[PDB]
Amino acid sequence: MNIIAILNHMGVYFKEEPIRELHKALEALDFQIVYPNDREDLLKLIDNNARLCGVIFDWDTYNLDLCEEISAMNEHLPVYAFANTHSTLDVSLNDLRLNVEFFEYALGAAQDIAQKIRQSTDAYIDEILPPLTKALFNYVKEGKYTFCTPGHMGGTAFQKSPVGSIFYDFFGANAMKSDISISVGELGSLLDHSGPHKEAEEYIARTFNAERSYMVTNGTSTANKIVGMYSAPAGSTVLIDRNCHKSLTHLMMMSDITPIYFRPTRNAYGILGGIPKSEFQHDTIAERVAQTPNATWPVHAVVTNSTYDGLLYNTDYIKEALDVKSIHFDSAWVPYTNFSPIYKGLCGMSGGRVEGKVIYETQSTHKLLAAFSQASMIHVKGDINEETFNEAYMMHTSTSPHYGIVASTETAAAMMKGNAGKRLINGSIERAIRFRKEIKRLNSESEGWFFDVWQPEGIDEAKCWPLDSKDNWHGFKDIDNDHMYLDPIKVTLLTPGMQKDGSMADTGIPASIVSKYLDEHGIIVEKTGPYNMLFLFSIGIDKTKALSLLRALTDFKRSYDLNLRVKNMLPSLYREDPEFYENMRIQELAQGIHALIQHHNLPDLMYRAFEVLPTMVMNPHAAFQMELRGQTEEVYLEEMIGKVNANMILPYPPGVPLVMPGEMLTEESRPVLEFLQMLCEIGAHYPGFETDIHGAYRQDGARYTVKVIK
């Protein structure tokens, strides 16, 4: 952050010679000088380069409205205006609001002006940096000797070893030097919420519209565990979204709590819909409590918002209708909701505090914002026992937190702020919408089949698109109005193979093949269903990557229409089993997998399996205790009925948990088992295309076994 732009090159020596002297003086202070040709050049340079730290221009040539244009992009960016004919009589109050510093043309004054610019640059950096990150950077500059943990002593131990020196050279000196512990009292303590850590927490809470915020260095899995254990004492009843991350299941195995499940919807593609508005009603919950052994009125509820596929709830209705004093939105997929008006009312922190309730949001800062893996945020709005919550927090936080992860959390919060952050979020949303429109246009232009995007017909402006009962693009039967919305950021592409009425088609291209092709050409997709692919158009996606994705998709279409050999299109798949893929073309593999899916009736079987709920003989805690005591055995899928499952069965082709520990299948829940059996067969017909049944163990002979209670 050392680039200074100097705008003009005038015709008078008394201005240019001081400017040349200042350029030399700034180069002596380790600044890189750039020379935009005109105002538009300068604006584009600021727009494309976040490392610009100052702008120098002639006030006679350009009015202070140029400073307003600069401020609209970055209101903190320092601008240095050189005054010759303008006086103090020529500045208005609004002009004085801008971050402009005035100088004069004089020979021999370059040193002092360069010093002033250096100080202004330091002030700008200090202003945009968040407090904990700034403290960490300063301490690293201090360079003290440590006889304390961590043992590498700021990277010395790495430098004393050959392989260690390779590691040190890869990760850099600063990363090693910033790996410190609480022995450094100047930075405070994460566990004690002291010093710069406390200010970082307050900074994050202010930025994310939370009454209070907590930094978690073991991911939203740990954040969910902290919130759930604070909110759900042993022997209590909890409402759980059946579309829940496995961390909630880990929490249920942690302590004796009786769950009652919200029932979500799904479409023909297996895209997970939202929970219907009825499930949040008092009567439904009371009936489920009555019909569930050892169940009382729930004291805590957990809802996944948004879904993996980008479906956001109307959270105001959930807050008003759900008669439980503790509501927790697992918002791991949407940490950006506070930073765009399109998400208003669609997130847990939206609005003010709810009377008689506490609201939690768990956010994965690493997933959709810019932070290191395992960085996570807990946001609280409402009354909590802060001391008790602190002990719940300490029970899952390491005594030696990774300071880089913590700093990355704070820095993501800081990036979210100001005109620059607003531009980043808005640009990501606009880029995603432009890509969606382009996919639609290409689909219209294609003579034959082309990729389609799962979205409403006439999307024009940036907003979350409601899912309406009249519109059938979403594929959800009898959906409630003003309930679910589509996040523009989560782009779902659809391959051919499904009809508009929810039925399958004669020909189709499984999305796994497209995913493998994209991976071969350097594009990693987030998630691949049977006929859908998910692309996260986050703030890390730029125009280059979007155009690259369009090129790769059209390249796949051209290669597929050319009936290329598998050995050519998919070298890695061929390397999996050269004998199997020796000669058959890509169309043949696509049609074979499509025919397997159709004959096994994957969509209908999946929908029926996830429509019915297996009976709960015992809660997950009891099942895990039985497994720990050894009272379990391994049986094949054939003997699933009548046996209580010990492990969460999580089929990955659907991707959502299907069986919970303590649940068993019966005659009514027979379809579930059937679907599972189907998966096994699908895994035994195409190497490289292996079905994943988490919680089941792949035994020799192309079969699966599951642990059940003895």
Added chain:
Amino acid sequence: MNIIAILNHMGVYFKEEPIRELHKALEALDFQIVYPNDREDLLKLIDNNARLCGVIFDWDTYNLDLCEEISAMNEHLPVYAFANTHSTLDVSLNDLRLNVEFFEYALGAAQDIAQKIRQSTDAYIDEILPPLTKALFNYVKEGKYTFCTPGHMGGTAFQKSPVGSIFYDFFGANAMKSDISISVGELGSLLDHSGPHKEAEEYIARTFNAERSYMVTNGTSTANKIVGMYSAPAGSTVLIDRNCHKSLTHLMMMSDITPIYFRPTRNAYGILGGIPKSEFQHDTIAERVAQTPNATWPVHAVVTNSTYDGLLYNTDYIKEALDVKSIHFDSAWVPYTNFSPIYKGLCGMSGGRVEGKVIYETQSTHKLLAAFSQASMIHVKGDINEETFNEAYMMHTSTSPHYGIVASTETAAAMMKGNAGKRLINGSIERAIRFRKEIKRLNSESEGWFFDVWQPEGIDEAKCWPLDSKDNWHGFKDIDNDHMYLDPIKVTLLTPGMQKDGSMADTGIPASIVSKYLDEHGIIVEKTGPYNMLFLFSIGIDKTKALSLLRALTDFKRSYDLNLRVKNMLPSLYREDPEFYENMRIQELAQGIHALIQHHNLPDLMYRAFEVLPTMVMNPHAAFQMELRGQTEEVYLEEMIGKVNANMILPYPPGVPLVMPGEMLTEESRPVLEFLQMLCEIGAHYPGFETDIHGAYRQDGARYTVKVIK
């Protein structure tokens, strides 16, 4: 890893000209050429610079025994011998065992030889790198486009923001690019133990003498929780070292397990000793089980080995004597035991598998080896249910592990290997012993008071020094023989203020003052007790730092003997409260704190408090559950008697937990309360010297409150 050493320059053109041509060709391949003057220069240059990647020398000038000398330092370092008069008849089998590649002198052959050297360098790097780290580095060089988590997309999002660009420039491009997720299938999955992750786990298990190893990215706290949950089902009885990390208490609050406590010893300094051999006996354990309600024969025992102060147990006796089927050594402080013969029989993984038992060792790779914070290892020797253990493991591991942390764990294992790693450990041990001897020598040289090191009188060779009953240096009364040993790496310095018979002294310098002084001069200590300081002489400590520490200690002695003002000697302490420290000298502050300690009788009170155990009305799980349900009140210290504590009380001057949740004080346990009642008073007399009572809360009025069961 690009420095090539060329040894000699003989007076013949037919060798010099090919050597210069090769030097130019190697410079063209991005190698840095260095020119040692002689054999000793080359050996020292290898010794001081781990970034060397090859050695070139003339076979006529130097025999192949030089290669043996090189190999003794680094057996993988490639050596290139140029043959002129020697033929294939002049190499023995032992010479051919060395990593020597032979070349010939010829004009115009520099390009081919440089290519051969480049390939040999690549082979060397591939050989020393561990598998997961190598895979990660290769993938980073691949440069794929990602539409998947993490959201920063390899650092693009950071580069699009000003503050984000500062963060990116600090941490470097590679750290951002290596932050990936399981969407990159070619690196496998930590949770599934697949691909390079499985190879990394097997590599670590081989390196650390474990049957099975697991990588944990949330610290030894999480590792302890995983082992404890796998080993201790709800309703079971568990043996816990009373000198246990707070993670074991977190596990106790996690599940309904009844603890029975091993009682450790301590000396006058508060240095925690070991559990006596009687407490591992069947009769003592059976009596304890009969004594406490709801207790059965323990199914799991946890022992801290070593102690924070470097006391290692004879683990063979513990394994043989302890009649519990599952033994877990919390070895967070000693991850290096397998890599030096001095630690044989003093660690959990020592020896073979114990019949009828499983042995666990939890290691903090970041604390004493070279790894990032939160990197931890679980080592298992014995039979476990792998599937169930995997369930416990995934219940505590994030679904998005930080790949840098994992790679750092693997890289610490790799650094531990070979002649280079053996030299690293041995050099650390020798450096610590040299520092200990120098402290003794300086103490003898000083006419007045000087720092003393807590160790036996006549230490000569590198070994763990046994704690014998005849010797009184350790200060433990009636200690068992062949039971506890001192780790040379953990250096405890003692300040004056304590006598050799365990009684206080009229004059004394509290170690907190020395610690503050050292911090002011850029030296961070690990732990500061009342009159002891702990210095970790890890592999990250070099001779420069040790000499700096000697200089700082001598400077403190000189300043203290000169009776300097606090405003000058300790500027930060003065800035804490200028009015209080306006004019007092350093000797006055030292004597005031010493007098407070003496009058309150800190040593005797602390020892008596930790000698007697509070009664356990209920296990920590029950107290934690009652805390969650709101059945708790805040009372002052004066009301500890008869009130069941809700939270673990961890006084910092001792540093070890004093009261567990569910424990209460009685007339027999009265001294504990008194000790606590003193600590606050000590913290109320000096603004910069505050006593920390963890689990107690400091509010207005300079007092402490503790939550107790209503």
Added chain:
Amino acid sequence: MNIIAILNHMGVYFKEEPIRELHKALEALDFQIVYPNDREDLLKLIDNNARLCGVIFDWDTYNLDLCEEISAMNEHLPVYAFANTHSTLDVSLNDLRLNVEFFEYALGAAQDIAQKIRQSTDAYIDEILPPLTKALFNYVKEGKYTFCTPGHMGGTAFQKSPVGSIFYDFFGANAMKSDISISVGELGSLLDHSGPHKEAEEYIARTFNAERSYMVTNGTSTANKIVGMYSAPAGST
């Protein structure tokens, strides 16, 4: 304080290449490097040049008694000893009393060592400077804008005039910038004996074996008048 002396030039690459790299790194931090030929040359160089701010030498070649010799001329002068064969077992208490900082020979470590030497030089300067003078120099480095007396505003008025510019060029920028008043509260007040002025007075009293000391800016004529008027009331002898 920007001249650093490097004593010797041995015959081993593993020492000389780190020394050359450190020389470049110190030149990058605005240090002037000088190379005495031997110990006597170094001692004479220290004796004749008070601007020397540090000495670098090889511990294998020279024992720490050389430091003692240096300390006999300037006990605050920082000396940097490079250790190769000597360990912590080879230093006595008396040696540790000297102002010696130890380093090691390693390629690529020149940046960190140069940073350490820069910090040690700053500490040396801070140690020898008296408190008020140090405060004045620091404030001049601050470079604030003044709308207060004196009227030249740190020399701006001089620079705006031809004859004033001659005067400013003669006396230098620092002399103009250090001409301040009590409007600058951080330096305290001479009249009120506050802030750095009080510490300067105590410093002078300690140095001159006085119970109390006062600073007079109008000469011993004024000092005599102050003492005499305090001591001799009207009508006395």
